[PDB]
Structure 1
Amino acid sequence: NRYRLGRKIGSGSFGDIYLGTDIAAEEVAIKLECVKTKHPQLHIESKIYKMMQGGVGIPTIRWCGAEGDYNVMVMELLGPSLEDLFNFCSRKFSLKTVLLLADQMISRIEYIHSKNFIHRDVKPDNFLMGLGKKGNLVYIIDFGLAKKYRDARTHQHIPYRENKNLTGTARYASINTHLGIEQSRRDDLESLGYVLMYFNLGSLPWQGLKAATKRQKYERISEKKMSTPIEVLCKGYPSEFATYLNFCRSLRFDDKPDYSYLRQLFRNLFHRQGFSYDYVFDWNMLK
């Protein structure tokens, strides 16, 4: 109930992230926002976490408020991110681990969409494993770029818009995001498709391109994504990864994705491969 701030561990969408301690009991994670910021957002994000509360893989917020020069949000401590675990696993995941992760990540995105929001920054850093009895559970974090895509009462979808600035991480952004189109449900899922192929490959082919300014930088990434057919991107990997991406790329702006179809693709592959659904990930094998 009273919190000690520890080392800074990084930065979220709109603030810095810290390890901390609840001195009376337990270790926590703490996000800070300057209270004098011109674009306050931490309390908005807190309310989204609250709307999401109780979902599988949705982190619990312990306290939000103001102290000194900061707005403060305290979260239950979670385990390593999927990017951290990727590094710990020598930047290679077995097919079994990719498929286990795919099943849960699709479900996390579906859940957020069911609560009327799109995430808009699907990337490995925003998925964290739980701890203790939740160690086999993938959590999704960070609603700082999240947006409501439909009305809570009528479910009327937001309108189509063009010439929008790229929101999120360029590496995993959808093609339509690069082309300036308003993001919708389909784009969260397309980004996940790039995340899965990133886990398969160790890098994506639009990493490390040269340019002068950040504007051109994103342009080069856009051009490489558009000019790399899915069959080339996914060459040498099971067809399901291409099928997944083609499905996502083919969705209409306001389509409700068939999340079950996408999970079934990978589940059927998992079964054909003879894998056991025992939640044993590559990092559980580290000695």
Structure 2
Amino acid sequence: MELRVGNRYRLGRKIGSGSFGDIYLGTDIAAGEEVAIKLECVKTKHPQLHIESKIYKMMQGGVGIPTIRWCGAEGDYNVMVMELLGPSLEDLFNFCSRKFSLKTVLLLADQMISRIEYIHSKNFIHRDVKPDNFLMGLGKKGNLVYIIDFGLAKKYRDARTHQHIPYRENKNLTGTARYASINTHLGIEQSRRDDLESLGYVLMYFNLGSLPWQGLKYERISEKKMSTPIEVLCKGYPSEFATYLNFCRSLRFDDKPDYSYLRQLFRNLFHRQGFSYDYVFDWNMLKFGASR
């Protein structure tokens, strides 16, 4: 027979994995809406879907945060059903032959910084910023970048008093080592500045096609990353990328970042380049011949 979850979500193929398990395509038979269903087996080894779910319900309403459809349990499974979106920035990056133009980078950089800014205003730090965790919406919102996966998310300050967490060494799950900030490698507790630093690496990745410490291991990546000076990394690209990264490496653990300044750098460069703020990305141009 047809496999269904709960009472109305028809389960489909496995579209991918995440931190808290795998994401499957699903169909709200009750209204014909293809959704994304995240499943977690009852093995209380480290049950987390309940947590990430709360954070999603907390970040609800903000621009670029997916809407959770339903939550529950089906046999040996915890189920979080959520709004299905479009391609991720990694899918789009490969779709464009792993080449983004300066325009697309800046267009993306503008929205990514704001998504991060929003998450922080809600007292949390994402802790795992990478191309895979940013998805383009569909339809009317095809021009909106979404931030997903609050699996490694952590609260960085008391929600009421806003008392920042203490400067201590890290005792928690790590994210990708490729986009990790230096502090993460040094074993220090992450804060707002770390989410931003990683973004710096995501942008250079979009520009470069591959980071210099890619394809080598953690101890090595740490070394290579610490050994590759910024100016050498951002070589041949607008100084705004190196300025962006330096600014980030400069923040103090509990400093509040100047998000306006970071968006400003790229915007001024945008205008100076003569680009227009239409949302015509490389992938939109590819149908005519070149996503470059």
TM-score surpassing 0.5?
A: yes
**2:147 corresponds to:** 140
Q: What is the Cα-based RMSD across aligned positions, in Å?
A: 1.0
CA shift, 1:208, in A, is 1.1
Q: Deviations over 1:17-52 (max 9, x none)?
A: 111111122100111011223111101111100110
Matches of 2:44 and 2:67, distance apart in 1? 25
> What secondary structure, in the 3-state scheme, does the structure 1 residue paired with 2:178 have?
helix
Kept in 2, the 8 Å contact 1:59–1:139? The answer is: yes
What is the aligned-residue identity percentage?
100
CA shift, 1:165, in A, is 6.2
Change (3 A) 1:78 1:170: same
Matches of 2:88 and 2:180, distance apart in 1? 19
Matches of 2:72 and 2:160, distance apart in 1? 29
Kept in 2, the 8 Å contact 1:32–1:73? The answer is: yes
Kept in 2, the 8 Å contact 1:185–1:257? The answer is: yes
TM-score (normalised: structure 1):
0.96
Kept in 2, the 8 Å contact 1:61–1:76? The answer is: yes
Select the residue among 93, 107, 110 that pairs with 2:100.
93
CA shift, 1:166, in A, is 6.3
Note the residue ranges of structure 1 that are not aligned, 5 or more in a row. Answer: 210-216
Matches of 1:44 and 1:163, distance apart in 2? 20
Q: Deviations over 1:126-150 (max 9, x none)?
A: 0000001000000000000000000
Matches of 1:13 and 1:33, distance apart in 2? 10
- Count of residue pairs brought into register by the alignment: 280
Select the residue among 13, 20, 24 that pairs with 2:19.
13
> What secondary structure, in the 3-state scheme, does the structure 2 residue paired with 1:176 have?
helix
Q: Deviations over 1:70-125 (max 9, x none)?
A: 00001111000000000001110010000000000000000000000000000000
Q: Deviations over 1:229-258 (max 9, x none)?
A: 100000000000000000000000000000
Change (3 A) 1:163 1:71: closer
CA shift, 1:164, in A, is 4.4
Matches of 1:5 and 1:205, distance apart in 2? 40
CA shift, 1:285, in A, is 1.6
Kept in 2, the 8 Å contact 1:95–1:200? The answer is: yes
Change (3 A) 1:67 1:166: closer
- Please identify, of 15-24 and 98-107, the stretch whose mean Cα deviation from structure 2 is larger: 15-24
**1:237 corresponds to:** 237
Matches of 2:171 and 2:82, distance apart in 1? 32
Matches of 1:54 and 1:223, distance apart in 2? 41
Kept in 2, the 8 Å contact 1:80–1:129? The answer is: yes
TM-score (normalised: structure 2):
0.94
Matches of 1:74 and 1:230, distance apart in 2? 41
Matches of 2:71 and 2:16, distance apart in 1? 19
Kept in 1, the 8 Å contact 2:170–2:190? The answer is: no
